[PDB]
Amino acid sequence: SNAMIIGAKKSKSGNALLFSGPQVGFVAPGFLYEVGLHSPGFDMEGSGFIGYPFIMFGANQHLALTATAGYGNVTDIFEEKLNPANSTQYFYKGKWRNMEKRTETFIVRGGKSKKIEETFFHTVHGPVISLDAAANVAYSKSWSFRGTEAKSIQAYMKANWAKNVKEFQQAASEFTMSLNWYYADKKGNIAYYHVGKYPIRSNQIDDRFPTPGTGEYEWKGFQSFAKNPQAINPKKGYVVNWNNKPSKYWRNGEYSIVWGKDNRVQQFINGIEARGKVDLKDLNEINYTASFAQLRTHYFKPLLIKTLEKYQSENKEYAYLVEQLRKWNNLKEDKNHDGYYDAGVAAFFDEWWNNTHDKLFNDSLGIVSDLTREITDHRMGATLAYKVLSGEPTNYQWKSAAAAEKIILESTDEALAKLHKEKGEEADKWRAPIKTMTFGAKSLIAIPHGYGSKTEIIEMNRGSENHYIEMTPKQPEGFNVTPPGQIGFIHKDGTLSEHYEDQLSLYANWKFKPFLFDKKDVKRA
């Protein structure tokens, strides 16, 4: 998910701006539900996740809000020491303790119905999620928000009812799960909060690994909200986020793999810093760039170019590749909708990267790549690969500088050889067919909730909805899109609601509908 908030000094109009882009996948019916809510002293328009009695992306009379997943450290796994005589007992604070036991029945549709029974266990730390019987260990899972999910619902409802920074910040302080919250108001203020209840951990443990559950390494309460990363009206004049790190010294234990030097939020940083004052049209251009960028270009294309230039006197193919790489705008886009990405050299670069990643790590991590490929080739960045290829300090010496340069060159020669064999020598012949997607029947909760849609759209690294909001003195104004459509109803006879997928064309074509707030405008929409 991505987000931007723009303060009054960085906005062309002098009004604070907000941009939302939650990434929750693409399904039909959609993951989001758009609504307008109006009662005395409470007027709000926007969307929330399906089933939520509150708006998460949108604006009330006074403020606009959005959110991105925090990736803060709110889950810890405890390694329970089991009694070798009784595997339902674990050692905790000096004595054997009994696990809580629960029998659950599952009715399974054949075919007729079957009845399955399973037993589930709880320790003082939480549910037992895994067993290492060979080590006489059970793993239990502690959530910092266990039992406070309803308090988080209440905090979001209070954010909807809030009228100013103080009230919004009070709601933020009550939210117990790990999110980033973003705020913009009609007075020009912006604010950022990394919300959640973060535990005070033992200083004797490495928080990248499970904690021993014997009682000496328990959480010691939660830190005050004032210690959560947060800022009102930051000096830079704006905040951008694409699930990246909140602040320099904020840690998230086992999931640090998402907060490295190479991070996809660079696309938003680059776009804001390339501009002076901005408007909503500028924010949309930045979303477009982020949505189509080949994210490895930011750090890896300069490295590739520099390497090829050292040898273009030897290899006559390298000067051509350098020219094509330099002119390429780093996007995989299809502006003419002809079904092929517009830059042929992007196909080369994709294959170069795949070859390079494999050569970098196959001979050391190949044997663990079932766990490490998702780290070293992560969708948010490839920090370790960049450090190895650029010669920057690492704890392990993965490759000498000479070996790293040979990898870059060999990956180039292999990618070019394959393209020359199968397509030809001119980059225009290398253009790859676009990847497409549909709004399907199964969301991230991994169960079917409908029948989906067969309409194919180009893949975009983009929010599942977008709001663009300007907090003008009169009211929030702007535009948005909430694909595939508002209404998920399919009649028994097969007739789809007229509003089942009538926003897919808007989404696919970078068009939007007006953000409605004034009742006089609502009646004429």
Partner 1 sequence: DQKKVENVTIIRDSYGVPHLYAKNKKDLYKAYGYVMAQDRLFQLEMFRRGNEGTVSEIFGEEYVTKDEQSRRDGYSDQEIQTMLNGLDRETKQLIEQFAEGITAYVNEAVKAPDQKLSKEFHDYGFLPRKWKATDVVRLYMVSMTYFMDNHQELKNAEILARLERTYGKEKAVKMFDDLVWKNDLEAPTSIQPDDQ
Which residues from 249-288 bind Ca ion, rule CB under 5 A? 253
Is 212 one of the binding residues for Ca ion (CB under 5 A)?
no
Is 237 one of the binding residues for partner 1 (CB under 8 A)?
no
Q: State the Cα–Cα distance between residues 456 and 439, nearest whole angstrom.
A: 8
Q: Find the farthest-apart pair of alpha carbons in the chain and give their distance in angstroms, rounded.
A: 76
190 vs 321, beta carbon nearer partner 1: 190
Q: Which stretch binds partner 1 (CB under 8 A): 216-224, 262-270, 308-316, 425-433?
A: 262-270
1 is catalytic: yes
Is 520 one of the binding residues for partner 1 (CB under 8 A)?
no
Phi, then psi, of 227 in degrees rounded to 5: -85, -10
Q: State the Cα–Cα distance between residues 391 and 37, nearest whole angstrom.
A: 55
Q: How far is the CB of 261 from Ca ion (least distance, A)?
A: 22
Is the four-CA dihedral 232, 152, 162, 463 of positive or negative sign?
positive
Q: State the Cα–Cα distance between residues 211 and 286, nearest whole angstrom.
A: 42
List the one residue from 31, 57, 198, 341 that touches partner 1 (CB under 8 A): 31
Q: What is the dihedral of CA 201, 202, 208, 212, to 10 degrees?
A: -120
341-344: long-range contacts (C-beta < 8 A, 24 or more apart)? Answer: 341/431, 341/432, 341/433, 341/434, 342/431, 343/427, 343/431, 344/426, 344/427, 344/428, 344/429, 344/430, 344/431
Q: Which stretch binds partner 1 (CB under 8 A): 227-235, 303-311, 332-340, 455-463?
A: 227-235
280 vs 382, beta carbon nearer partner 1: 382
Token pair for 386: 């960049």
> Nearest-CA neighbor of 242 among 481, 22, 466?
22
List the one residue from 106, 166, 336, 421 that touches partner 1 (CB under 8 A): 106
Q: How far is the CB of 342 from partner 1 (least distance, A)?
A: 28
Q: State the Cα–Cα distance between residues 81 and 89, nearest whole angstrom.
A: 8
Is 377 one of the binding residues for partner 1 (CB under 8 A)?
no
158 vs 201, beta carbon nearer Ca ion: 201
Q: State the Cα–Cα distance between residues 97 and 81, nearest whole angstrom.
A: 10
- For residues 288 and 512, is the Cβ–Cβ distance under 8 A? no
Is 334 one of the binding residues for Ca ion (CB under 5 A)?
yes
What DSSP state is assigned to residue 515? P
Token pair for 384: 């370790």
Chain centre to alpha carbon of residue 422: 36
49 vs 96, beta carbon nearer partner 1: 49
Q: Which amino acid is at 369?
A: S
Choose among partner 1, Ca ion, none what residue 454 binds, the Cβ cut-off being 5 to 8 Å by kind: none
Residue 334-373 contact track with partner 1, rule CB under 8 A, x = bound: ------------------------------xx-xx--xx-
Q: State the Cα–Cα distance between residues 311 and 309, nearest whole angstrom.
A: 5
Which of 1, 178, 411, 453 is catalytic? The answer is 1
Residues 6 or more apart whose CB falls under 8 angstroms from that of 267 comprise 242, 286, 289, 290, 293, 295, 298
Q: How far is the CB of 162 from partner 1 (least distance, A)?
A: 14
429 vs 513, beta carbon nearer partner 1: 513
Choose among Ca ion, partner 1, none what residue 104 binds, the Cβ cut-off being 5 to 8 Å by kind: partner 1
Choose among Ca ion, partner 1, none what residue 40 binds, the Cβ cut-off being 5 to 8 Å by kind: partner 1
346 vs 380, beta carbon nearer partner 1: 380
List the one residue from 124, 131, 231, 305 that touches partner 1 (CB under 8 A): 231
List the one residue from 138, 162, 177, 469 that touches partner 1 (CB under 8 A): 177
After what residue numbers is the chain broken, C–N > 2.5 angstroms?
110
Is 448 one of the binding residues for partner 1 (CB under 8 A)?
yes
352 vs 386, beta carbon nearer partner 1: 386
Packed helices 401-422 and 297-310: angle between N→C axes, nearest 10 degrees: 90
- Binders of partner 1 among residues 126 to 155 (CB under 8 A) are 127-130, 139, 141, 143, 145, 147-154
Is 391 one of the binding residues for partner 1 (CB under 8 A)?
no
- Binders of partner 1 among residues 178 to 197 (CB under 8 A) are 178-180, 192
51 vs 94, beta carbon nearer partner 1: 51
Q: State the Cα–Cα distance between residues 93 and 466, nearest whole angstrom.
A: 50
Choose among partner 1, Ca ion, none what residue 334 binds, the Cβ cut-off being 5 to 8 Å by kind: Ca ion
Is 73 one of the binding residues for Ca ion (CB under 5 A)?
yes
Choose among Ca ion, partner 1, none what residue 244 binds, the Cβ cut-off being 5 to 8 Å by kind: partner 1
- Binders of partner 1 among residues 477 to 496 (CB under 8 A) are 485-494
List the one residue from 256, 315, 354, 438 that touches partner 1 (CB under 8 A): 256
Q: State the Cα–Cα distance between residues 101 and 78, nearest whole angstrom.
A: 18
Annotated binding-site positions: 73, 75-76, 254, 334, 336, 338, 340, 342
Choose among Ca ion, partner 1, none what residue 448 binds, the Cβ cut-off being 5 to 8 Å by kind: partner 1
Measured between alpha carbons, how far apart are the two ends of the chain, in Å? 29
Phi, then psi, of 212 in degrees rounded to 5: -65, 140
Binding residues for Ca ion (CB under 5 A): 73, 76, 253, 334, 336, 338, 340, 342
- Active-site residues, by number, are 1
